[PDB]
Amino acid sequence: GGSEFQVRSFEEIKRSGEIRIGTEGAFPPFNYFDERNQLTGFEVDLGNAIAERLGLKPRWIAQSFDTLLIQLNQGRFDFVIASHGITEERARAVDFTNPHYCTGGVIVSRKGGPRTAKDLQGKVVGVQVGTTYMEAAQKIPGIKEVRTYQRDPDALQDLLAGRIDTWITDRFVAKEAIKERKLENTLQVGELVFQERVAMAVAKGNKSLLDALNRALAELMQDGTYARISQKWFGEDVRCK
Ligand SMILES: NCCC[C@H](N)C(=O)O
Numbered sequence: 001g002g003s004e005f006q007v008r009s010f011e012e013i014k015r016s017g018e019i020r021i022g023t024e025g026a027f028p029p030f031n032y033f034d035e036r037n038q039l040t041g042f043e044v045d046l047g048n049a050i051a052e053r054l055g056l057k058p059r060w061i062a063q064s065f066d067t068l069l070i071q072l073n074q075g076r077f078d079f080v081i082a083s084h085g086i087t088e089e090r091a092r093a094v095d096f097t098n099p100h101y102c103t104g105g106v107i108v109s110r111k112g113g114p115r116t117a118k119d120l121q122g123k124v125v126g127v128q129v130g131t132t133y134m135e136a137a138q139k140i141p142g143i144k145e146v147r148t149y150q151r152d153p154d155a156l157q158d159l160l161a162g163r164i165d166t167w168i169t170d171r172f173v174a175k176e177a178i179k180e181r182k183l184e185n186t187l188q189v190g191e192l193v194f195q196e197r198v199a200m201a202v203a204k205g206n207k208s209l210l211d212a213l214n215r216a217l218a219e220l221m222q223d224g225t226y227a228r229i230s231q232k233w234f235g236e237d238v239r240c241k
Contacts, residue, residue, distance in 0.1 A: 003020075005075035005076050007073070007075045007206055008209070013056065013078055013209065014054075014055075014056070017057060018056060018058075018059055019051050019057070019059065019078050019079070020076070021051070021060050021061070021077055021078065021080070022061050022068050022071065022072060022079070022080040023039070023041075023044065023047070023081055024064070024082045024083070025062030026065070026151045026152065027041070027082070027083055027173065028177070029041055029042055029172065029173070030170075030172070042101075042229065042230070042232075042233040043082065046100055046229055049225050049226075049229060050216045050220070054212060054216050064150065065128065065129065065131070065151075066129050066130040068080050068082050068084075068201075069090065069094055069201060070093075072094060072203050073093065073094065073203050078206075079097075079213060080200065081200045083170065083198055084199060085132040085196035085198050085199075086099065086196070086198070086199050087135075089135075090201075094201040095201065095202045095204055095205070095206065096199040096200065097199045097210060097213045097217060098218070099240045100200065100217060100239075101240065102196070102240035103170055103195070103198060104192040104193070105133050105168055105170060105194050106170070106189055106192050106193065107119075107166055107168055107189075107190035108156075108168070108169060108174045108190065109165060109167075109190060110159065110165075112188070113188060113190075114165055114166045116190060119190070120140055120143050120166060121142045121143075122143075123143060123166055124145045124147055125137050125145070125165065125166045126155035126159060126168070127146060127147070127148055127155060127169075128148070128149050128150070128151065128152040128155060128169070129148050129149065131152075132194070134146070134148055136168065136193050137168055152169055153177075155169065160183075160187075168193060171189075197240055200213055
């Protein structure tokens with residue numbers, strides 16, 4: 001159906017009564033399509049609670065991860081919530097909110113497989129395109145091959161099939177995939193390779209919206225809504241401490 005692309009200030013958004021939110025929809029349990037083919041996840045619930053707290057009806061747009069930041073700047077959405085770690089490189093093209101969770105990238109291998117960055121010597125490592133996982137894998141020398149996937153669950157599929165030695169991904173995504181697929185006796189979570197603060201993104205220079213999102217997030221963290229949503233998803237509070 002197409003849409004009107006525009007980078008919108010907070011007051012322009014407020015006038016419309018609607019906030020357009022970009023996400024990926026292939027990164028469970030943060031944002032994904034469930035068994036009845038509807039968009040959900042910790043970040044969807046969070047996104048909706050943000051929209052609500054601002055007096056705005058959310059309109060969700062799922063699309064491939066590698067495209068999200070560039071379509072944000074082109075004006076397809078007002079903000080993106082799609083598990084983006086804050087990086088200096090990314091902050092050149094977008095403005096990040098205060099982080100809505102903290103986490104890290106972790107080595108995942110089959111039983112008896114690589115557990116440390118050092119173990120990745122002559123190994124084949126699977127990572128999703130445009131991610132901090134791919135970025136870190138590119139900097140670990142002596143990996144035989146960094147294999148890059150458009151979608152992160154595809155890397156998991158290749159780890160299981162034995163086409164790669166190691167998948168590097170988010171620690172919560174790794175834990176949940178193992179629980180979901182009952183892979184406790186088949187997969188092995190190794191070392192935390194790096195830690196990261198994960199945040200919403202706004203088009204570069206969209207300071208009015210940036211500030212409103214920060215305020216709404218602060219409010220959710222104070223009024224118990226964040227705690228409730230984190231509990232539902234993780235049985236614990238995942239905010240940066
Ligand atoms: N597809 C989602 C990737 C999320 C990861 N934390 C990153 O920042 O690259």
